[PDB]
C-alpha cells in the first residue's frame, strides 16, 4: 500500500481532512489545520531570518513540543537540517560542523556557540512561508556512531517516506492510533516515527522527557530500544500498547516472550541510519533471526558481511559541499555487520569491529551476550574484552532484574570455556562499547 503526496505531507492531511486530530503536544490536541498554522509561524519567522531553499542548519535540541514544530518548519523552508545530540562535546563539533556546509544553528532551549553559524531564534511571524513540495530534495543530515569521527548521512523525503512504507507494511498503524515520539530525533529511530505518522496520516505525541509510561498515556504504538522495553515490563506499568517496535541492538527471545505476557505485541527490526531506519523486520516469534527484508529491499551476505540495497539508502556522506557515495564497486552499503541468511531471513551474529581474539579463538561478544539473556534475571549484558599476559579475555559487564546473580556456573553447559567471563562485573550509573572497554581496564 502506497501513499501519494499532493502536497507536504501535514498540508496533504490538512487539504484532505484538517479537522481531524493530528499531533498532541503534551495534553494539547491540534487538528491538521491547527499544526499547519503554526508550522507556518516558525517557518515565516525563519524565513525572515534568512533560511532559504537548501540552507544548512544545525538543530542542537532535545525532544520537545518546540523541536518538533522547528523540525517541520525547517523542512518546509526547504532547509537541509542537521539534528544533533545535545550531549557531544563542544571540541567534536568544531571538528565536524565547518565540513557540513552549515551557515545556521538553532539551539532553542540554550545557546549558539559556534560564532561560525547565524544564530537563529524561534519567531513567530505571519503568514505562512513554504518552499515547493519536492521528493527528492535533501531533507536530513544524520550523524553516525564509532569508528573515528562521525559522518552525516544525507536523505531526500524521497528516502524517508520509503523508509516509512516498509515498515507500514508490516506494522498496522491505523487512522486513530497515536505513535510517541518515543527515541531521539537527532538519530534515524525518532526521525522514522516523524515520517511513519506523516506516511499514514494518524497520530503522534511529543512530550517532555519524563517517565516513559507516562510519556505513553493513550499512545497505541511506540518505537523502543529492549532497555526502555525491560524498564516498562519490570515495573508492571498500565500501558494500553497495540505494538512496539525495537531496535538498536539485538532483541532477546525472554522480553519479547514478557512483552507478550503483559499484552505487547512486538515487533524487531535491524537498522541503520545509513538506511532511515529499518531494513528487516517481523513480528516477534521466539526465534533469533530479525526476520526478511521489506518490500523495497534487498540483502545479500559476501564473506560473512551484510550488503545491502534499499530505496531508502542515503544519497551520501557529506563532505565538504559534496555527496560521497555509500556503495561499493558493485552497488551495495557494505554494512561491517556480520550476518547469516537462512529461508530468505537475515541473522545478525554481530560488528566486525566488535571481534576480539583470546588465545587465538574469536571472541564475537555479541554471539556471547545473546547466550547470556537468556537468563531471566538478566537485563543488561555486554562482553567486553580485558588484555592479559592470552591477548585478550573476556569480561561480563551486567545489569540485572534486581540484586546480582552469579551465572559461571550456569554459562558451563552453553559457552565454551573460553568464552566464559574472567569476572563477572556490573554496569556503572546506546552504549558505547569503546567507553565499556576503557572503564573494564581502569578496574
Ligand atoms: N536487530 C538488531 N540486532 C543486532 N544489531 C542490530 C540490530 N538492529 C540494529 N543493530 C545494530 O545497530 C547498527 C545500526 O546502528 S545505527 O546506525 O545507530 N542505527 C540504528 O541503530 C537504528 C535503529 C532504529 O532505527 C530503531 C531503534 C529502535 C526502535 C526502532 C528503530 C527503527 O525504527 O528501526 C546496525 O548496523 C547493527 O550493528
Ligand atoms: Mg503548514
Redesign the pocket.
Known amino acids: 500500500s502506497h501513499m501519494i503526496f499532493s502536497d507536504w505531507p501535514w498540508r496533504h492531511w490538512r487539504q484532505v481532512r484538517g479537522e481531524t486530530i493530528a499531533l498532541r503536544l503534551n495534553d494539547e490536541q491540534l487538528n491538521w489545520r491547527e499544526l499547519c498554522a503554526r508550522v507556518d509561524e516558525l517557518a515565516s519567522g525563519f524565513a525572515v531570518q534568512g533560511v532559504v531553499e537548501g540552507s544548512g542548519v544545525m538543530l542542537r535540541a532535545w525532544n520537545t513540543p518546540q523541536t518538533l514544530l522547528a523540525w517541520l518548519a525547517l523542512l518546509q523552508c526547504g532547509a537541509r537540517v542537521l539534528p544533533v545530540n545535545p550531549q557531544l562535546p563542544q571540541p567534536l563539533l568544531e571538528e565536524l560542523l565547518p565540513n557540513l556546509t552549515l551557515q545556521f544553528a538553532l539551539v532553542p532551549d540554550g545557546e549558539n556557540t559556534f560564532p561560525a553559524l547565524t544564530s537563529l531564534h524561534i519567531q513567530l511571524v505571519e503568514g505562512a512561508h513554504a518552499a515547493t513540495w519536492q521528493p527528492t530534495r535533501l531533507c536530513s543530515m544524520t550523524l553516525?556512531?564509532s569508528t573515528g569521527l562521525p559522518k552525516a548521512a544525507v536523505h531526500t523525503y524521497q528516502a524517508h517516506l520509503a523508509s516509512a512504507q516498509g515498515?507500514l507494511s508490516l506494522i498496522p498503524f491505523g487512522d486513530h492510533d497515536d505513535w510517541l515520539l518515543s527515541?531521539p530525533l537527532f538519530?534515524?529511530?525518532g526521525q522514522?516515527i516523524m515520517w511513519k505518522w506523516l506516511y499514514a496520516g494518524a497520530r503522534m505525541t511529543v512530550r517532555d522527557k519524563q517517565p516513559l509510561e507516562q510519556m505513553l498515556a493513550g499512545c497505541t504504538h511506540a518505537?523502543?530500544?529492549p532497555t526502555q522495553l525491560w524498564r516498562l515490563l519490570v515495573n508492571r506499568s498500565s500501558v494500553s500498547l497495540k505494538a512496539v517496535?525495537?531496535?538498536?541492538?539485538?532483541?532477546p527471545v525472554e522480553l519479547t516472550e514478557q512483552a507478550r505476557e503483559q499484552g505487547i505485541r512486538c515487533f524487531?527490526?535491524?537498522?541503520?541510519?545509513?538506511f532511515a531506519?529499518?531494513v528487516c523486520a517481523k513480528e516477534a516469534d521466539g526465534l533469533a533471526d530479525?526476520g526478511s527484508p521489506l518490500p523495497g529491499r534487498e540483502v545479500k551476505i559476501v564473506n560473512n558481511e551484510v550488503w545491502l540495497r534499499a530505496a531508502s539508502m542515503a544519497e551520501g556522506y557529506w563532505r565538504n559541499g559534496q555527496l560521497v557515495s555509500l556503495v561499493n564497486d558493485e552497488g551495495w552499503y557494505a554494512?561491517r555487520?556480520r550476518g547469516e541468511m537462512h529461508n530468505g531471513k537475515l541473522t545478525?551474529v554481530g560488528?566486525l569491529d566488535n571481534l576480539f581474539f583470546s588465545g587465538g579463538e574469536g571472541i564475537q561478544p555479541?554471539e556471547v551476550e545473546r547466550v547470556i539473556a537468556a537468563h531471566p534475571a538478566v537485563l543488561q549484558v555486554f562482553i567486553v574484552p580485558v588484555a592479559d599476559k592470552f591477548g585478550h579475555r573476556p569480561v561480563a559487564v551486567m545489569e540485572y532484574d534486581h540484586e546480582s546473580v552469579d551465572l559461571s556456573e550456569w554459562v558451563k553447559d552453553k559457552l565454551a570455556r573460553f568464552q566464559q567471563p574472567v569476572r563477572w562485573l556490573t554496569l556503572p550509573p546506546?552504549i558505547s562499547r569503546q567507553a565499556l572497554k576503557e572503564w573494564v581496564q581502569r578496574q
Not at 269 to 274: P, Q, R
Request: hydrophobic share 40%; aromatic share 2%.
Open positions: 553516525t556512531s515498515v527515541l538519530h534515524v529511530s522514522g518505537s523502543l530500544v517496535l525495537l531496535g538498536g541492538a539485538a532483541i524487531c527490526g535491524y537498522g541503520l541510519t545509513e531506519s529499518t530479525v554494512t555487520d545478525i560488528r555479541e546506546k
